[PDB]
Amino acid sequence: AALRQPQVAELLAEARRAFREEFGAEPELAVSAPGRVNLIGEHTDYNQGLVLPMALELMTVLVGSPRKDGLVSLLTTSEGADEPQRLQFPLPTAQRSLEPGTPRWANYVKGVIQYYPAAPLPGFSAVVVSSVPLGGGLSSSASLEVATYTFLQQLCPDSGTIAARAQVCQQAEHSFAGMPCGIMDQFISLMGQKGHALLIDCRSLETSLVPLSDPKLAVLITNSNVRHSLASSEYPVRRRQCEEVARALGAASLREVQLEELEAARDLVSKEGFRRARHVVGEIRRTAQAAAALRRGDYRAFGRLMVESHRSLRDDYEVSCPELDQLVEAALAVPGVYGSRMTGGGFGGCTVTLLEASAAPHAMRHIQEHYGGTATFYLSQAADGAKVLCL
Amino acid sequence: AALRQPQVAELLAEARRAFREEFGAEPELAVSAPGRVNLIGEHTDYNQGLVLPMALELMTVLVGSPRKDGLVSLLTTSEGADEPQRLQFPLPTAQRSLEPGTPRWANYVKGVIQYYPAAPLPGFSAVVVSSVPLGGGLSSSASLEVATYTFLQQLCPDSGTIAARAQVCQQAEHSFAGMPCGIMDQFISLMGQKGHALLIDCRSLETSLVPLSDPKLAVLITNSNVRHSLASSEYPVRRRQCEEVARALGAASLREVQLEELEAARDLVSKEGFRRARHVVGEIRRTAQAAAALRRGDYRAFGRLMVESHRSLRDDYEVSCPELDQLVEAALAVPGVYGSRMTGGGFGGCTVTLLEASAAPHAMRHIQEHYGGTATFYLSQAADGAKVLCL
Ligand SMILES: CC1=C(C(=O)Nc2cc(C(=O)O)ccn2)[C@@H](c2ccccc2Cl)N=C(Nc2nc3ccc(F)cc3o2)N1
Ligand SMILES: CC1=C(C(=O)Nc2cc(C(=O)O)ccn2)[C@H](c2ccccc2Cl)N=C(Nc2nc3ccc(F)cc3o2)N1
Ligand SMILES: CC1=C(C(=O)Nc2cc(C(=O)O)ccn2)[C@H](c2ccccc2Cl)N=C(Nc2nc3ccc(F)cc3o2)N1
Ligand SMILES: OC[C@H]1O[C@H](O)[C@H](O)[C@@H](O)[C@H]1O
Ligand SMILES: OC[C@H]1O[C@H](O)[C@H](O)[C@@H](O)[C@H]1O
Ligand code: NA
Ligand code: NA
């Protein structure tokens, strides 16, 4: 029993209603920006690797209007968001930059404003709503940043590429949330096309659309409904460790390293650094091969590469957890399932499973059965990326 | 001096003004869709080959509103559009379809209406304005088809992918304009992105967005300001000879014939047919090589491939003309020019030239001085594709 994914109209209607009540008039401007699931290619983006995500129908919607007084006035209805759920602050100026603070949700919006590259930006009033489960590993924060960015463009048009916009949002994440993420989540939020996954080269920033127009193929997202303590915590540790192995081999990044050279330099790096790098180098290759497999509709090869991804994440990268692992095994048991793995950052969040559409009802029954906690499910079609909604 | 390329704000103001005057009120909706230049990979798209175009800052803008009376009412301000520049007709029904007629510009709009895949489409009033030179080989027609399609989506949302939209527009062109084009021009108008070229695999319909980010380089477009009597005419003949050569070789398309295989099979095909197919099969190889050169930043190699493309089109495919050849040779004599070739269908239209951006003033003077006609020029950056503009 998959979760009804609210369509853009229901989200818009919630956004506008709350805006009216809060501000005393209709909003002038509106935007949407989706979350994402990564099909394969985990912990490779900040290593200048390859990733293969798709945009989801789960999305963040933001409505608003310019002001004349230089202030930003925000309201979110999102029920998980930390309080307060309203916030105001001045626009950054030459005299005074904004800073990270509480509530944490607002730091994503503050950051994007701070680094927005075009001027002059007026103040604004806005309400944000989201169907993206909050920090459950489908990029809620990126959807919020890219929604913000896309709204600011309506107030004050920018002049660069789409990669530059993704980089602005990434910068907000680094400086205002203390989270040194790669570019994947932002970039897919911006670049998603419905009926397509995106092979993103995080070194070149070349992207290619890979079809998913098979009605016999389903992508099932299972949320573990767990978020252990370590996104805050362990993600920046894995990044630094990767960067250190690259530095030690005289490589600009691990993208430049392959498994033979790594093995020959075992003595130059920690045992644990070796294992992390081994994951990354292998994951880059798996992603390139998975993309090719996906293209020729060889789902079986694709699902195999997914499973190898999961084992490498669990064992070498150590960013799985008992729950994700159990969900993965539960799903692998089901006839018609090609593959399953954790997706996103790890320590919680969701698995992604590729399967025959007709197995999806049994898949969901059996996973729920064989999981201790309580899963939720999304039956997920690949979706468009960010856009303006004309009011 | 390059011709000025009006920005979207200026085209939108012209279109709103024409619309106010013609229909008595502000328009409700707006869209834009760009023209294009093809960097390399000519007369390959209908051979299921590879093409490498980019969208231009020259574009078509449509503003309009829904009607209640089931009528379509149109007006263009584009100065060389054939008469009448305003007209009105009822929507097609199940019993009665639209048909190709006069004027020719409106056939593009009629065709997209006729094949528009969603229902119910209301009547509408629209103004179309364009900076794409009509019939100058920068795909004014595709930009009009795509702007129309994008506008129809605001009246009645469609449900397929971006590639399906490209195909609707192609079908409109085949049936309403007698022009059996490939997919390239529609695809690039829909999928272009600022700062990127688009590598289109016209067999699988995969696309890659390839960054063009070297600010020391430019693309100079030279309009010969000639269009001989053959867009109409020799284009379908070429396409039909490619088809017969493929059939004679037992191949589904020339995409499945390798250059060395073709060379050994001279006896299976006519002399002329061989030469046509040699152009096509070689050009597909050149396109893959050119994309690789672009990725590695090798503009000298990219340029040499462009020149080889031109020589092939000129001698093997015979779709150049003496103006284009004179323009190409004049370009290649300027220091800082890496390559130059005809672009688009041939028999007139434009050349595309890759050069040091600092050589561009010298090149425009040298080329005009050494051209028997009157060239016009554009310095165009890679631009965005089709979009909605909120009024
Ligand atoms: C900066 C830039 C490009 C650009 O369009 N940038 C852009 C545009 C916009 C906008 O539309 O708003 C916004 C943000 N950035 C163009 C360019 C720039 C100036 C005049 C004409 C052109 Cl076409 N291309 C290149 N050059 C390039 N061509 C190559 C060819 C082969 C190759 F192997 C490598 C190549 O490197 N440099
Ligand atoms: C990673 C993250 C958040 C977070 O806590 N980041 C953090 C953690 C730490 C740390 O741990 O020390 C330090 C600094 N930052 C929160 C979040 C996550 C989970 C529960 C509640 C919340 Cl608030 N929000 C988001 N995303 C998000 N909030 C939205 C609100 C509205 C909206 F429309 C869209 C929104 O998308 N993602
Ligand atoms: C290829 C073609 C056209 C053409 O004549 N096609 C044709 C030729 C024949 C034949 O030859 O028998 C038979 C059937 N079709 C015309 C054209 C071409 C040249 C001069 C004047 C015109 Cl009108 N229009 C366009 N494009 C276009 N018209 C626009 C108008 C407004 C607008 F905003 C955008 C527009 O983009 N391109
Ligand atoms: O692949 C793991 C993934 O983890 C988090 O989602 C980050 O936001 C991404 O940049 C990426 O590093
Ligand atoms: O590459 C030649 C080119 O010629 C015309 O522009 C057609 O519209 C395109 O489909 C393509 O065939
Ligand atoms: Na359970
Ligand atoms: Na001249």
Q: Which residues of B are annotated as a binding site?
A: 36, 42-43, 45, 135, 137, 139-140, 185, 235
CB contact under 8 A, B194 and A295: no
Cβ neighbours of A177 (radius 10 Å): 20
The answer to whether B311 touches B304, Cβ cutoff 8 Å, is no
Which residues of chain A does B204 touch, with a Cβ-Cβ cutoff of 8 Å? 295
Distance B330 CA to ligand 7 centre (A): 11
Closest among B310, B314, B259, B308 to B281, alpha carbons compared: B259
Distances (CA, A) of A92 to A169, A311, B377: 16, 45, 43
- Distance, in Å, from the CA atom of A57 to the CA atom of B353, rounded to the nearest integer, reads 42
Render A89-158 in DSSP notation, one character per residue.
Answer: EEPP-SS------SSHHHHHHHHHHHH--SSPPPPEEEEEEE-S-TTSSS-HHHHHHHHHHHHHHHHS--
Instruction: Nearest by CB to A206, from B161, B206, B210: name it.
Output: B210
Token code pair at residue B53: 């175009």
| Residue B206 near chain A (CB below 8 Å) | yes
Distance A344 CA to ligand 4 centre (A): 5
- Distance, in Å, from the CA atom of B232 to the CA atom of A95, rounded to the nearest integer, reads 64
| Residue A7 near chain B (CB below 8 Å) | no
3-class secondary structure per residue, A293-355:
HHHCCCHHHHHHHHHHHHHHHHHCCCCCCHHHHHHHHHHHCCCCEEEEEECCCCCEEEEEEEE
- Upper half-sphere CA count for residue B4 (Cβ side, 13 Å): 5
Q: What is the rounded (10 degree) CA torsion for A127, A390, A119, B57?
A: 150
Which residues of chain A does B295 touch, with a Cβ-Cβ cutoff of 8 Å? 204, 206
Q: What is the 8-class DSSP label of residue A357?
A: G
Closest among A254, A261, A354 to A52, alpha carbons compared: A354
The answer to whether B324 touches B348, Cβ cutoff 8 Å, is yes
- Distance, in Å, from the CA atom of B368 to the CA atom of B383, rounded to the nearest integer, reads 26
- Distance, in Å, from the CA atom of A384 to the CA atom of A5, rounded to the nearest integer, reads 15
Which residues of chain A does B390 touch, with a Cβ-Cβ cutoff of 8 Å? 29, 154, 388, 390-391
CB contact under 8 A, B194 and A154: no
Residue B188 distance to chain A (closest CA, Å): 14
The answer to whether A12 touches A367, Cβ cutoff 8 Å, is no
Length of chain A: 391
| Residue A194 near chain B (CB below 8 Å) | yes
Q: Which residues pair with A51 in a beta bridge?
A: A200
Cβ neighbours of B76 (radius 10 Å): 26
Residue B3 distance to chain A (closest CA, Å): 21
CB contact under 8 A, B196 and A161: yes
Task: Spell out the residues 6+ positions from residue B9 whose beta carbon is closer than 8 angstroms to its own.
Answer: none
Instruction: Nearest by CB to B211, from A205, A208, A387: name it.
Output: A205
Strands A71-76 and A124-130: parallel
- Distance, in Å, from the CA atom of B103 to the CA atom of A51, rounded to the nearest integer, reads 49
Q: At what angle do helices B162-177 and B104-115 cross, to 10 degrees?
A: 130
| Residue A118 near chain B (CB below 8 Å) | no
Task: Report resolution in angstroms.
Answer: 2.2
A227 three-state secondary structure:
strand
Catalytic residues of B: 185
The answer to whether B245 touches B276, Cβ cutoff 8 Å, is yes
Please report which helix (H) or strand (E) contains residue B113, including its range: helix B104-115
